[PDB]
Amino acid sequence: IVGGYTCGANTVPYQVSLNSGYHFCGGSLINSQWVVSAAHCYKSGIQVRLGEDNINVVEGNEQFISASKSIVHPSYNSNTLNNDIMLIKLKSAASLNSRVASISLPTSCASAGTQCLISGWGNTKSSGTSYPDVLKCLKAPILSDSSCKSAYPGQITSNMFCAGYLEGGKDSCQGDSGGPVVCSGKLQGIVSWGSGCAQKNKPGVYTKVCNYVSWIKQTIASN
Ligand SMILES: CC[C@H](C)[C@@H](c1cn(CCCCN)nn1)n1cc(COc2ccc(C(=N)N)cc2OC)nn1
Ligand SMILES: [Ca+2]
């Protein structure tokens, strides 16, 4: 997260960190047993870390659970990142508390101009490398399709949307991938790609979660 702010310990209880020796992606808890993330976060042997703030200190509220299953969307394309969505089953259930709680799936798509909360432990610098101790937060609106497609000619599909700031300065970055875009208590986006970080006329692109609510539900029911 570039140009964001410190969320505060467990103010974002559905945020998880995906760890493979190191934090490499975020994710969202949707029930006691499942995580929504980005398909391009797939790795063998992921460990899911819930209840985290300082990801570099054992602080007491953390839960550490291995991924038992890792389901990439069957139409995912890693060249274009269309259908960039993945579901992670926890080998055991998460103990839901005030520090650790799930996020609702959308009943309907959000619309351009809606304000959202983007969070994660990714890079906090444009043109550099500086990953944070504590979870970072960003307030950011869904942008219009015409803004998105003029920012990214010939690259935006019906399963993506832009959000953030055309002026730049404030954006998600490397390390936030798979992380939540929450708008009005609903999980509407997944941190996906972007051209650089926080640069002018290069907003972030996000997986349009509302297009997948039936997939998520059937997949949870079949596994
Ligand atoms: C795990 C996939 C991939 C292998 C890996 C990765 C690491 N490097 C090298 C970095 C050196 C420069 N620091 N290249 N690809 N990766 C990609 C991402 C997502 O990246 C972005 C997300 C959002 C935005 C946004 N403007 N909103 C921008 C993003 O990047 C432009 N995170 N890790
Ligand atoms: Ca911790």
Alpha carbon distance 207, 190 (integer Å): 5
Give every CB contact of residue 60 below 8 A, 6+ residues apart in sequence: none
Report how far Cα 129 is from the mean position of its chain's Cα atoms. 20
* Residue 34 and residue 220 in contact, taking contact as beta carbons nearer than 8 Å: yes
Could you tell which of 174, 192, 200 is best to mutate to test the pocket of ligand 1, judged by most ligand atoms within 8 Å of the CB? Answer: 174
Q: Which DSSP helix (H) or strand (E) runs through 34?
A: strand 34-37
* Residue 186 and residue 136 in contact, taking contact as beta carbons nearer than 8 Å: no
Fold: same for 5-7+103-211 and 15-102+212-222: yes
In the set 23, 40, 119, 192, the catalytic residue is: 40
Among candidates 177, 169, 196, which has minimal Cα distance to 5? Answer: 169
Which ligand does the CA of 58 lie closest to?
A: 2
Instruction: Say if ligand 1 is within 6 A of residue 194 CB.
Output: yes
Closest residue (by CA) to atom 24 of ligand 1? 194
Q: Is 73 a catalytic residue?
A: no
Strand order in the sheet with 115-120: 5-6, 136-141, 115-120, 180-183, 186-194, 204-208, 160-163
What are the boundaries of each domain within the chain?
5-7+103-211, 15-102+212-222
Half-sphere exposure of 114 (CA within 13 A, CB side): 20
Which CATH number is correct for 5-7+103-211, 3.40.1160.10, 2.40.10.10, 1.10.540.10, 3.30.365.10?
A: 2.40.10.10
Residue appearing with tokens 């509302």: 210
Resolution of this model in Å is 2.4
213 is in an annotated binding site: no
Give every CB contact of residue 118 below 8 A, 6+ residues apart in sequence: 1, 4, 137, 138, 140, 163, 164, 172, 176, 179, 180, 181, 189, 191, 204
164 is in an annotated binding site: no
175 is in an annotated binding site: yes
**The CATH homologous superfamily of the domain defined by 15-102+212-222:** Trypsin-like serine proteases (2.40.10.10)
Spacing, Cα 106 to ligand 2 middle (Å): 29
**From which experimental method does this structure derive?**
X-ray
Number of the ligand 1 atom closest to the C-alpha atom of 202 = 26
Report how far Cα 150 is from the mean position of its chain's Cα atoms. 24
